[PDB]
């Protein structure tokens, strides 16, 4: 007696019409013996021959082949249906769960032929079991309630179940139910006497509704396996996480690795995917076989290492403060832990920077703290007060001179090496008593030869070719080459805003070793200036 | 009699489907109660799976009263009902409307919440109170009523606003009056005080008529221009000083072609030192005063296409200050501007970056009479997270985020 939830085909077209040859007998014998009983519970209606519509039918088997099962494909019908409501995008973090005494979970069985469809629409899911042919006229009928497969079966189903579950949930206000397409969840601090007749109440409800529940007193019992996860009553963790080990590695198996890794990085802290990710950069041959480097095979190690114990999260207390600290792991990648307590983590996780050639200790985190905020934002509908290994002079330092626009919530500060620091601040303004170096690069795109030099003040020149380089490259090479030959003060002056445009970001790392090298320079320096001038305007340039 | 307006999408269009942001658990219990309140008076009501589409909600502040106000970010809806609105239903712009002295924006949102929305029409007006932890879908409704922050109720109001507004404009004929969302901007040339007490005047008049309202905002519009670019000055000249001068008139000579820096270039010709001070010759003061002269006059032949969308650029300038330009196209500016704000702590940089974006799009309405589309100096993720938290507005402006500018300081400033 469920209200049916009015459907429409997409405006401009009609029921879908295919035929259906295959197959052979005993599959359309096993057809008829399931059709008749479930014609039989009024699932299914036979509808005498007219010109409706059709959709195609197969027959196939389950382990155990006294079991059969049929299947009909809905594909073309579901192109030609509305849209519908998002059922659920994700599914709810353990982490963001609240303990409760007991917890029961209930399964609903033939869900979507336990609730009614649309009269008018039921038309368009005719479909027809062949008699074998002589020309015999074959069986057709329609569906009364949600077929299999439908593209609004679990939407339709879901709403149902909540308008079900809506008159049991006034009546008892204490007890918590979460739905998912197939389950019912309900938790209690009720004393288990009581939970169980509230239980039983409720699965009562359910049925009269026609809707069935496993009469095993509460079915399965803690701890439970779900969607990947352990629910154990007072921890939550993962379930057991297999890294295989073999000889040879394809991409596939890479994917799979890289998968796991970070999957378990929710619950178990440190775990670094950086150089099995570099093994997958490649986007050639999904099927290639990829050799191991020696820091992928370390980092792997280190994951075994860590997976060798197993680790466990809590549940969340609203009672108690939320807190998130962050780690550096130094290759450029961050890990944090999500706590209200000391021995105790809700979560974990880590942040990676994939974007950028040239990025800083400061920006990292920031973004870290961003991802986070966005997650407890997510989980718990809060935002968590942050410990970072950052002195606020630093950060103020950072976010004042920064072109951006940055935000921290609450924070305060971890003496946990390793620091975030500024390795080196550039002059605002030209040093007095400074050699001026007028740097200048060039490259040939063809050949790609190119020279790199400075021009100073005091007289001194020097022009150093190189191979295999570009543009941008040699313009950077002389700055290097500036910092090199140069002092502890030093003004270096170039017409490449790219080059400037790197070193004013300010980054305390790069993938370029030619940028690594000039930032070590640039840390080793007392005072540094550098500054732009319009090329090729013939004031302080150098021609080669 | 009137029944409903009704209203069409441009074929070829279905109706907006976008993702609801997670919200703060206050927000969520916020958005709860508006929303049931809202049911209860009919404005509202529930909706099942058959309805695909969905539209963003969010929570912030009203006048900065302690009370919440639910906020509808309908961009994409409008986007989508253009026709309806610009086209078929529009509301004409005045260009007299920038030359008023004082320039005073009253809420009249409430107004919309009277008339009933066309039926077929209001699958489109669906919105989703989400849940924390994805615990349960969210809560479904739609709008049974013209819904605040879509265009289409300015549009559709518009002959009772005219007809309300008509015995007030013929005691006021040098008052300007015009409609912008929920907010109706009005201009005059009087005394800020006598001013204050016509928009009293007016209020008393919306209010007798029916229309509720929620010191004052007040604009002023004869003082917004096209700002000019100011070079350093400066009694002595640094081999630095002379480059930064040559890079920058360099810069400005893509907005004004007869940018001449010979006698700038000439003088730095030999290689010294940054620090070294270098006096100006009689050729390099005579080609820094043309440069000077050339610069305070407004760009040539930079008119407002009103086809082409507007778009504002934002940069950061530090010590709580950021500037501004609006453009259509590249180098043609038909307005620049800079926005600062209260000392000591009252701050923080997306705050500032909010009131900067707001404030610019309140002059971009009242001048051209519709939004530009901003570039954001912000990580995309920040802004998504904060934005809502400063946000006075009833409107949302379009939007992008850039990692890119190069523009250091100096040269807006
Ligand atoms: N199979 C499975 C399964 C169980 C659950 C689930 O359990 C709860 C249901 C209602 C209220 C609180 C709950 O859990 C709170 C945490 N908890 C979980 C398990 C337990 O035994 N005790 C306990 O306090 C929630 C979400 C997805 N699920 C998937």
Not at chain 1, 398 to 411: K, L, M
Request: hydrophobic share 35%; charged share 25%.
């Amino acid at each position: 007696p469920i209200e049916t939830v009015p459907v429409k085909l997409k405006p401009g077209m009609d029921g879908p019409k295919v035929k259906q040859w295959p197959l052979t007998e005993e599959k359309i014998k096993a057809l008829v013996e399931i059709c008749t009983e479930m014609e039989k519970e009024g699932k299914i209606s036979k509808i005498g021959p007219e010109n409706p519509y059709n959709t195609p039918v197969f027959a196939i088997k389950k382990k155990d082949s006294t079991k059969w099962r049929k299947l009909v494909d809905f594909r073309e019908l579901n192109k030609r249906t509305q849209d519908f409501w998002e059922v659920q995008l994700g599914i709810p973090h353990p982490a963001g769960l609240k303990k409760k005494k007991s917890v029961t979970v209930l399964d609903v069985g033939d869900a979507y032929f336990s609730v009614p469809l649309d009269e008018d629409f039921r038309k368009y899911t005719a479909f027809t079991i062949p008699s074998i042919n002589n020309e015999t006229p074959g069986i057709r009928y329609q569906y009364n309630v949600l077929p299999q497969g439908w593209k609004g079966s679990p939407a339709i189903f879901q709403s149902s179940m909540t308008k079900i579950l809506e008159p049991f949930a006034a009546q008892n206000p204490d007890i918590v139910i979460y739905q998912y397409m197939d389950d019912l969840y309900v938790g209690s601090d009720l004393e288990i006497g009581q939970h169980r007749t509230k239980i039983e109440e409720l699965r009562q409800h359910l049925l009269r509704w026609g809707l069935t529940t496993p009469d095993k007193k509460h079915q399965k019992e803690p701890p439970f396996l779900w969607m990947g996860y352990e629910l154990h009553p007072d921890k939550w963790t993962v379930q057991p996480i297999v890294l295989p080990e073999k000889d040879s590695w394809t991409v596939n198996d890479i994917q799979k690795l890289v998968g796991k890794l970070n999957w378990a990085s929710q619950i178990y802290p440190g775990i670094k995917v950086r150089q099995l990710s570099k093994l997958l950069r490649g986007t050639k041959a999904l099927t290639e076989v990829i050799p191991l480097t020696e820091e992928a095979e370390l980092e792997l190690a280190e994951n075994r290492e860590i997976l060798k114990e197993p680790v466990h999260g809590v549940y969340y207390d609203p009672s108690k403060d939320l807190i998130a600290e962050i780690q550096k792991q130094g290759q450029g990648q961050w890990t944090y832990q999500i706590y209200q307590e000391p021995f105790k983590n809700l979560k974990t996780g880590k942040y990676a920077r994939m974007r950028g050639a040239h990025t800083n200790d400061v920006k990292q985190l920031t973004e870290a703290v961003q991802k986070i905020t966005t997650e407890s934002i997510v989980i718990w509908g809060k935002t968590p007060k942050f410990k970072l290994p950052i002195q606020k002079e630093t950060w103020e330092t950072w976010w004042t001179e920064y072109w951006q626009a940055t935000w921290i919530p609450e924070w305060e500060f971890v003496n946990t090496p390793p620091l975030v620091k500024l390795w080196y601040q550039l002059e605002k303004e030209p040093i007095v008593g400074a050699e001026t170096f007028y740097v200048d690069g060039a490259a040939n795109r063809e050949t790609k030869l190119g020279k790199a030099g400075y021009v100073t003040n005091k007289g001194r020149q020097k022009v150093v070719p190189l191979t295999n380089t570009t543009n941008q490259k040699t313009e950077l090479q002389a700055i290097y080459l500036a910092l090199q030959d140069s002092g502890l003060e030093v003004n270096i002056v170039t017409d490449s805003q790219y080059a400037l445009g790197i070193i004013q970001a300010q980054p305390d790392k790069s993938e370029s070793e030619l940028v690594n090298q000039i930032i070590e320079q640039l840390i080793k320096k007392e005072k540094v200036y550098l500054a732009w001038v319009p090329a090729h305007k013939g004031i302080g340039g150098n021609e080669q | 009699p009137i029944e409903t307006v009704p209203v069409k999408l441009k074929p070829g269009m279905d109706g907006p489907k976008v993702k609801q942001w997670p919200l703060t658990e206050e927000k969520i219990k916020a958005l709860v109660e508006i929303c049931t309140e809202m049911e209860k008076e009919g404005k509202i009501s529930k909706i099942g799976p058959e309805n695909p589409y969905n539209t963003p909600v969010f929570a912030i502040k009203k006048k900065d009263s302690t009370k919440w106000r639910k906020l509808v970010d309908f961009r994409e809806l409008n986007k989508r009902t253009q026709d309806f609105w610009e086209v078929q239903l529009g509301i004409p712009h005045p260009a007299g409307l920038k030359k008023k002295k004082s320039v005073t924006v009253l809420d009249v949102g409430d107004a919309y919440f009277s008339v009933p929305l066309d039926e077929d029409f209001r699958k489109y007006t669906a919105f989703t109170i989400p849940s924390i932890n994805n615990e349960t879908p969210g809560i479904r409704y739609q709008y049974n009523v013209l819904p605040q922050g879509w265009k289409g109720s300015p549009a559709i109001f518009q002959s009772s606003m005219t007809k309300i507004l008509e015995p007030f404009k013929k005691q006021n004929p040098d008052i300007v009056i015009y409609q912008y969302m929920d907010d109706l901007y009005v201009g005059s040339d009087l005394e800020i005080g006598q001013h204050r007490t016509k928009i009293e005047e007016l209020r008393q008049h919306l209010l007798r008529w029916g229309l509720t309202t929620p010191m004052g905002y007040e604009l002023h519009p004869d003082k917004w221009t096209v700002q000019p670019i100011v070079l350093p000055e400066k009694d002595s000249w640094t081999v630095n000083d002379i480059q930064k001068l040559v890079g920058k008139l360099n810069w400005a000579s893509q907005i004004y072609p007869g940018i001449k820096v010979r006698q700038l270039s000439k003088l730095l010709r030999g290689t010294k030192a940054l620090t070294e001070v270098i006096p100006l010759t009689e050729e390099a003061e005579l080609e820094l005063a043309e440069n000077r002269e050339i610069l305070k006059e407004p760009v040539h032949g930079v008119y407002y296409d009103p086809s082409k969308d507007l778009i504002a650029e934002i940069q950061k300038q530090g010590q709580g200050q950021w500037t501004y330009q609006i453009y259509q196209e590249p180098f043609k500016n038909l307005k620049t501007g800079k926005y600062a704000r209260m000392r000591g702590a009252h701050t923080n940089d997306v705050k500032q970056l909010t009131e900067a974006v707001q404030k610019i799009t309140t002059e971009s309405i009242v001048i051209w009479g519709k939004t530009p589309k901003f570039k954001l100096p912000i990580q995309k993720e920040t802004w998504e997270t904060w934005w809502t938290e400063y946000w006075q507005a009833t409107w949302i402006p379009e939007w992008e985020f850039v990692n890119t500018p190069p523009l250091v300081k100096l040269w807006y400033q």
